Design a protein around this ligand. Structure first.
Ligand code: HEM
Length: 291
């Protein structure tokens, strides 16, 4: 199965910047969500989970088909809580019914990262909705209770290498774990709706204790009130990951650049872009537009 990007008919950069802007304005407006964290983090996670079902071996799953809209995928236990991101995007889709679902879910993530003062993420249009029977089964998203070997092997299926994995994990600066949603509780840091390299700094610099939470799962906790999942912590247990964590803790621009590449790649896995497709778009933030 080849998934060829097909530009929504007649649309160009300005159309998608209008969608960007509507997402960004609603992100600003709907600020109460999740104890005033706002929807940025869950939109980033929605983009990732709708992309991260991809299997490089047979091109099943991935962002192209926008299959999260079907009940098997929106009810994946691994996706618990993402319905909030979907509901956020609903009025956006109603205003711009021409955008594909995959394009909207992925654009939500780009918009969230950028509006949270993260790197620019080039974004390409052209995902096309595919039917219900193309929805990937549950179980393709990763477990959190595992070690570095798990993480490394997991991400090979998404064609990500060590640097790409450690960069992508930096998105765990954002938002928080919610006990009822996954069995883990707590934020990873203080700046959880501003995109920074704090995840790496906290991994290296907090004093972590291995504790059990109220769902009887182990997680790493600090006196500052932060947590790390076992898979996060694996990034400093494994010496290869550790080196990269230290790099990003010590170079914010490098983290931004590597995250941007890896996140675009994640959002584009499985899609074939014709030779004459438009170049990737780089959207202006609301701030850059004076909006
Ligand atoms: C080994 C890989 C990963 C594992 C096991 C993992 C696991 C988790 C878990 C358990 C949660 C908490 C869900 C909840 O209780 O609300 C979470 C939240 C989150 N993850 Fe991941 N994650 C991984 C990779 C990633 C990647 C690659 C990204 C995106 C680049 C990402 C972005 C997020 C965001 C932004 C949140 C916060 C969501 C919110 O506040 O609502 N994660 N992750």
């Amino acid at each position: 199965l080849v998934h060829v990007a097909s530009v929504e008919k007649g649309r160009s950069y300005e159309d998608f910047q209008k969608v960007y802007n509507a997402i960004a304005l609603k992100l600003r407006e709907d600020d109460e969500y999740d104890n005033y964290i706002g929807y940025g983090p869950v939109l980033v996670r929605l983009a990732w989970h709708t992309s991260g079902t991809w299997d490089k071996h047979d091109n099943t799953g991935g962002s192209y088909g926008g299959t999260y809209r079907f009940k098997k995928e929106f009810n994946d236990p691994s996706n618990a809580g993402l319905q909030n991101g979907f509901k956020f995007l609903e009025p956006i889709h109603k205003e711009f019914p021409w955008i594909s679902s995959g394009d909207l879910f992925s654009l939500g993530g780009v918009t969230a990262v950028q509006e949270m003062q993260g790197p620019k993420i080039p974004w390409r249009c052209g995902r096309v909705d595919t039917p219900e029977d193309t929805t990937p089964d549950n179980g393709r998203l990763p477990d959190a209770d595992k070690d570095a070997d798990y993480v490394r092997t997991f991400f090979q299926r998404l064609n990500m290498n060590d640097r790409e994995v450690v960069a992508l994990m930096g998105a765990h600066a954002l938002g928080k774990t919610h006990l009822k949603r996954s069995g883990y509780e707590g934020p990873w840091g203080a700046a959880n709706n501003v995109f920074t390299n704090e995840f790496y700094l906290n991994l290296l610099n907090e004093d972590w204790k291995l504790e059990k939470n109220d769902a009887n799962n182990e997680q790493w906790d600090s006196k500052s009130g932060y947590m790390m999942l076992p898979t996060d912590y694996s990034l400093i247990q494994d010496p290869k990951y550790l080196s990269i964590v230290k790099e990003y803790a010590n170079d914010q621009d490098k983290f931004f650049k590597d995250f941007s590449k890896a996140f675009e790649k994640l959002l584009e896995n499985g899609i074939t872009f014709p030779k004459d497709a438009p170049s990737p778009f780089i959207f202006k933030t609301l701030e850059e537009q004076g909006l």
